[PDB]
Symmetry: C2
Subunit: 103 residues, 2 copies
Amino acid sequence: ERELRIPLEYGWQRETRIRNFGGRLQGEVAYYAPCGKKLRQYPEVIKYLSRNGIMDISRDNFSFSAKIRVGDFYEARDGPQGMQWCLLKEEDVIPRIRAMEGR
Amino acid sequence: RELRIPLEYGWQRETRIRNFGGRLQGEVAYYAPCGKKLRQYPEVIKYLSRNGIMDISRDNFSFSAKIRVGDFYEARDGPQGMQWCLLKEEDVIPRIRAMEG
């Protein structure tokens, strides 16, 4: 976890979006670079680090596993403006992770 | 454009909307590249001075909850209790207009 938190200390964001596809929970991880650029897979992170001369952090500091309790978790909820990503309180994340483990 | 410049240097701008009995209240916070949360212009200016950041100044910052820059969250009651819901891009102008009416 220490490893995967380093980028947050450099002003990156980690986001996990959770969807329940008929009882089955699935997560998708994205990073936002400090400039706001959205990165959706390792190759995208490596290119960003290469292109931007970033050497303090590496591919080792990043994971796209939705089962890692690092950064912010969202679940879709309906409302008067339609579906929104709603932030899970840290204490509601665990059951989501646990549902995605095993399998 | 001026208010986007800090975001490129790894500042975050966040607007929280609370509905108090149908009266919307918006509140803006900045997170400096070090993560420090700043809530007022004097704190932002002290932070710029104390950390010798000088590319940006007062003109690159707004604490007005009516500006479409950065992420908007609205507090929404639900099954899990109070949650911050991320406003979609299309959600923001309507909720700003709601704040004014």
